[PDB]
Amino acid sequence: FVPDVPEGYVAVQYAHRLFSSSLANKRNRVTYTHPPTGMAYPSPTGRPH
Amino acid sequence: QHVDAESIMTAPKGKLFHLQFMDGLLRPEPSAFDPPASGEDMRLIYPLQP
Amino acid sequence: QHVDAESIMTAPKGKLFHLQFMDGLLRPEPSAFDPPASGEDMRLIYPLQPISVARSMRAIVNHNEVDRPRGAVAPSSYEMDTGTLSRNGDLLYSPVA
């Protein structure tokens, strides 16, 4: 049972670069970097998907 | 010590249990160059007083 | 060990004594709120060459929030090039064009 990808998503190609390590708040965290918008998100929460 | 997220839903109405809150202003910050550690911190019961 | 500021003025001309220099780039920095300590650091004998010819690269760690951590050197573009050997001569690089 292949669960089809939901209605509205941004398909990003995995790179060995888009994941960077930078300081957020009071500690060091692994951070995502959104390719089309160039953002931060230093915690595993809203990314967006 | 810490209250359980089940004893705070099915306990007698009369009981008075105390919680424990954190300040965090004189917390020691991270270093300059360092490999980031994993895992995250959570909070479940906030006051509304203040 | 360290040379004395008197043995480096009244010693035989022939002698070859070695010094010792500091890098300081991966030095641990101070805290946030803290009572400042007293005393200062001094230096008396500097080179004029400049020193450090055996280089290649330095500081193999990535910075807290910025990209390149100041004086960081990347490997030379030649330490990574195998060129085929000629029939008579024996070693040469790539075309480049």
Helix H segments across B1-50?
Answer: none
Beta strand spans in chain A (E): 20-24, 27-31
Q: Which of B50, B47, B49, B41 is nearest to B8 (CA)?
A: B47
Residue A23's Cβ-count burial label (10 Å; 0-12, 13-18, 19+) is buried
Interior CA angle at A41 toward A39 and A42, to 5°? 130
Chain C CB within 8 Å of residue B50 CB? no
Q: How far apart are CA A23 and CA C79, in angstroms?
A: 34
Would you call A23 and C65 a contact, using CB atoms and an 8 Å cutoff? yes
d(CA A32, CA A38): 9
d(CA C61, CA B34): 8
CA C9 from chain centre, in angstroms, equals: 27
Copy the structure tokens of residue C21. 């220099």
Place of tokens 């965090």: B24
Question: Resolution of the experimental model in angstroms, please?
Answer: 3.9
What distance in Å separates the CA atoms of residue C97 and residue C95, rounded to the nearest whole number?
5
Amino acid at C67: D
Q: Within a 10 A sphere around the Cβ of A29, how many other Cβ atoms?
A: 19
Biggest CA pair distance of chain A: 43
The experimental method is cryo-EM
- Residues 6 or more apart whose Cβ sits within 8 Å of residue C47: C21
Cα angle: C33, vertex C35, C37; to 5 degrees: 130
Interface with C, mutate which of B26, B29, B33, B34 (most C CBs under 10 A): B33
What residues of chain C lie within 8 A of the CB of B34, using their CB?
64
Taking Cα atoms as reference points, which of C48, C65, C58, C47 lies closest to residue C25?
A: C58
What is C24-58 written as a DSSP string?
Answer: -SSPPPP-SS-PPPP---------SS------S--
Residue of C nearest to B32 (CA): C64
Contacts made by residues A28-31, CB under 8 angstroms, sequence distance 24+: A28/B30, A28/B31, A28/B34, A28/B35, A28/B36, A28/B37, A28/C64, A29/B36, A30/B36, A30/B38
Instruction: Give A-chain residues touching C64 at CB under 8 angstroms.
Output: 22-23, 28
